[PDB]
RNA sequence: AGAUGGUAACAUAUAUAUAAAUGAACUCCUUUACAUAGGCUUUACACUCGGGGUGCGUUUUCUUUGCACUUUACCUUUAUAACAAACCUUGGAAUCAAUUUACUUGGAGAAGAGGUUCGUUGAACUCAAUUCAAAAAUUUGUUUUGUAGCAAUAGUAAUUCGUAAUUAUCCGAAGUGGUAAGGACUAUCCUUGAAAAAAGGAGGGAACGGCUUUGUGCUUUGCUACUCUUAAUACUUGUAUGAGCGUACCAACAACCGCAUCAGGUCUCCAAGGUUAACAGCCUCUGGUUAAAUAGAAAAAAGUAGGUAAGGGAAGUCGGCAAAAUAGAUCCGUAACUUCGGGAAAAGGAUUGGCUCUGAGGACAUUAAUGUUAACUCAGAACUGAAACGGACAAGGGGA
RNA sequence: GAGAACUUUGAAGACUGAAGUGGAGAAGGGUUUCUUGUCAACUGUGAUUGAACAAGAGUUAGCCGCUCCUAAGGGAUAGCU
RNA sequence: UCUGAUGGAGGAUCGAGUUGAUACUGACGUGCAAAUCGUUCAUUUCAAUCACGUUUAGGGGCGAAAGACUAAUCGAAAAG
């Protein structure tokens, strides 16, 4: 199964970056409660504008929104940004109002 | 109560109607007045 | 409300002079499933079509004397 | 195990009322709550329904009897004299 | 002044009278509103909100 | 001139709509229609757990996280499914058996096997339609669709768009037993726990086709495709659907009664979470409120409502008045006397937290053996702490 | 608003604690209901509030009830006093 | 006869609520109140509690009996 999180609008406005996002996911998603045992079942790939998360185990899409909120809170963008779903397998970053 | 007889309701309506002040054009030339909480109809 | 399954009874009820309107409901399921509902004096009769072709043919064969109500 | 030495069914009354009164009521409650022989079906399953009415659980047939027993000696004797003739 | 609007907002939002919030500024528009229709429209535009219910978690 | 299936229990009219299965007088029943107690059980609602989705919240640190929504009415004899019962057919029981928590039942016919019905419920069960193979001049197995119709078009929670419309979700499994109702039972009465309106069933068998014709409804001659039941229409019938009355609000907290906007009195239903035996107490969510014939400041005497007090412990007082003393639960132990039932929580002892463990108590399948999965309920052991743990709340003083 | 401790709004701290100042009814009340004004008196302090005062308005049923039935019982008829 | 379970009787027990009212002879006693408030106490499967309806009317009624109650009125109500 495959999930997409897009940050096109914020990284276009140059408030976010993809490398930090991808590293945060790589060292933040825990499988079997362990931070860095994702190994071969769960992997994440980077795009110039998107972030791909390919999963091979039961997994909640809400995790991506939770971690994205965590990142944009620790980097003081929480009060400008929101995570809104688009399709069955897609989140995207949006602005307020 | 909410449940009423026709005659009782008509009496209540008449008692309400008789509770209005004297018209000003008539005063240009009333004591039988009651408040629902002070003097009970008893009827 | 009554559901009718066979097609002959549905056609007969539609042709019966007491019917006034036919309600056409169409909706996606997973393919769009539809249902045709004849409004009579007594009951509203529903027939459920999974077959898109069948539910294209049947209301066309339905006589246009009686009115149509498309809900979606 | 054995629960009460002698009061039996009158243990429901506790210590109230006299011991003589409780023993007297035990003697008659024993037969008021007993099952009797139904002579219509032969099964010992006729129990008291009201004060003078006794119904068989099997027959569903009910007879008029004593207040506390299916029969009383006076009625039994009277029936005996009648049936002698 | 805004008691009528509070009552109507509670009725149309199907929430408690204590759970509706009026914009502290721009209360003149709210006072102008005097029907379910107006209350609904300017709730939609955001002058009245429904406060979230107090949190009662079962984590513990 | 009045239908038919099943051995039987009984069943059958599915027309748009199961409307019609002849039936008089006179009858005989049933429903309406009924107490209390106890547990057992089923269902719905309630509550709760986990998964998926959507939105929000926390984010110095931690948090696959905390919260909210994720809905489905009446009606369709709702069809079916399931279950407690009763009944029918077959069967023919002691080595008695079946069976309940409990006892209940049987040669007046049990168990087993196969059926019928009612009542619970109200889409359960492949339920209905549909796709594929095997049976024959129409049956059994395999897939898709649909929240079974109502029904998504409504509701809810979201994302957008001029400011009315678009879009996406509304589905995967369970646990506790609070409330309500039903069921099948057992028990109690020197107590046996309404009636009628209304409705239904039965026994009975009074009356009997049509067109035409003789004589005086009857015998008669010649011919036969005919009687009821639902719905619609047309015309007659006085105008050939749905009368009248109540419906706001309070119900006490200022709308009632207490002379009042009076700390009083005044009937009924719903009843969340935590702790817990608990609808107790205490705290909390939804809903409601922050109001009470006043406020501010100061803060002595005295009053009133409480706390705490060294040592002594009823010396106080008419009198232990008032207060204090434990008081939950588990384990142990319990006298005189006795109507043998009690006394009794007699008296009187011990333990109780937290944490980490150990043991015991069930359900579901495969060809004696191996996996999946659920409640809280007990028992025991280490460790731990200012020796404290029914830590607040709640809660016997005993004895002669 | 002339005037604000007791009118309204927002924020906070709290309370009621589903045996509730939460929702529905009965008895009783009778317009206290709603809207708009409004403050002479009343609302035991204030008051711009109000169950006060003033002007208007508001109660929609074949299916919720009464209406029907009978009960404890009441009245009346026939008589008889 | 004895033992363990099962069972669920009783004008049985504790106890909220209800229904009352033991004590403080507490507060109040120009009360919130012409009987209230607080704590304490009694009561909860039955001779139980409540509502509405209905019957009994004054030298009469009604009384698990205090001369109690019979609309703040009782060793004879209230009105004229």
Task: Find chains touching chain C: ≥3 CB pairs under 8 Å.
Answer: none
Spatial distance from the CA of E54 to the C1' of G57 (Å): 40
By what technique were these coordinates determined? Answer: cryo-EM
Partner chains of B (3+ C-beta pairs under 8 Å): none
Structure tokens at C44: 């509203």
In whole angstroms, what is the distance from residue A30 CA to residue A23 CA? Answer: 13
Residues B24 and B32: their CA atoms lie apart, in Å, by 17
Give yes or no for CB of C8 within 7 Å of strand F: no
Alpha-carbon distance of C47 to C54, in angstroms, equals 11
Q: What is the biggest distance separating any 2 CA atoms in chain D, rounded to whole angstroms? A: 53
Q: Which long-range contacts (CB under 8 A, 24 or more apart) does A27-36 make?
A: A28/A67, A28/A70, A29/A53, A29/A63, A29/A67, A31/A57
Question: Residue D8 gets which letter from DSSP?
Answer: G
Q: Residue for token digits 């979606």?
A: C72
Q: Which of D 34-73 have CB under 7 A of nucleic chain F?
A: 40-43, 45, 49-51, 57-59, 67
Identify whether the C-beta of residue C72 lies closer than 8 Å to the C-beta of residue C27.
Answer: yes
The Cα-based distances of C45 to A54, A56, C3, C22 in angstroms read 49, 48, 5, 9
Q: Quote the CA–CA distance of B35 and A88 in Å, as a whole number.
A: 68
* A2 CB closer than 7 A to any strand F atom: no
CB A59 within 8 A of CB A42: yes
User: Nucleotides of chain H within 7 Å of a protein C-beta?
Assistant: 1-7, 9-12
- Containing A90, the helix (H) or strand (E) segment is strand A90-95
């Amino acid at each position: 199964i495959k999930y997409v999180l897009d940050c096109t609008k914020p990284v276009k406005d140059t408030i976010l970056d993809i490398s930090g996002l991808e590293q945060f996911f790589k060292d933040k998603i825990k499988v079997d409660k362990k931070t860095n045992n994702l190994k071969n079942k769960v992997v994440v790939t980077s795009d110039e504008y998107k972030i791909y998360i390919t999963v091979h185990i039961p997994f909640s899409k809400r995790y991506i929104k939770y971690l994205a909120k965590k990142y944009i809170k620790m980097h003081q963008i929480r009060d400008f940004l929101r995570v809104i779903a688009k399709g069955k397998l897609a989140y995207e970053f949006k602005y307020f109002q | 109560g909410s449940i009423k007889r026709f005659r009782l309701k008509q009496r209540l309506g008449k008692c309400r109607r008789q509770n209005r002040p004297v018209p000003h054009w008539y005063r240009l030339k009333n004591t039988k007045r009651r408040h629902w909480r002070r003097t009970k109809l008893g009827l | 409300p009554k559901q009718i399954t066979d097609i002959r009874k549905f056609l007969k009820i539609s042709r019966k002079p007491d019917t006034t309107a036919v309600i056409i409901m169409k909706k996606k399921s997973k393919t769009v499933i539809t249902k045709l509902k004849l409004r009579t004096k007594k009951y509203l009769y529903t027939m459920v079509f999974a077959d898109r072709k069948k539910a294209e043919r049947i209301e066309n064969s339905l006589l246009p004397s009686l009115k149509r109500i498309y809900y979606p | 195990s054995r629960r009460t030495k002698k009061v039996g069914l009158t243990g429901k009354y506790g210590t109230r009322y006299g011991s003589s009164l409780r023993k007297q009521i035990k003697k008659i409650e024993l037969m008021q709550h007993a099952k009797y022989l139904c002579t219509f079906c032969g099964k010992t399953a006729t129990k008291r329904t009201c004060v003078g009415i006794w119904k068989c659980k099997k027959c569903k047939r009910k007879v008029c009897g004593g207040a506390w027993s299916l029969t009383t000696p006076a009625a039994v004797a009277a029936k005996s004299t009648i049936i002698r003739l | 002044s805004l008691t009528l609007q509070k009552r109507l907002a509670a009725s149309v939002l199907k929430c408690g009278k204590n759970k509706i919030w009026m914009d502290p500024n721009e209360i003149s528009e709210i006072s102008l509103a005097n029907s379910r229709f107006s209350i609904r429209k300017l709730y939609k535009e955001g002058l009245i909100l429904k406060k979230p219910q107090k949190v009662h978690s079962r984590a513990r």
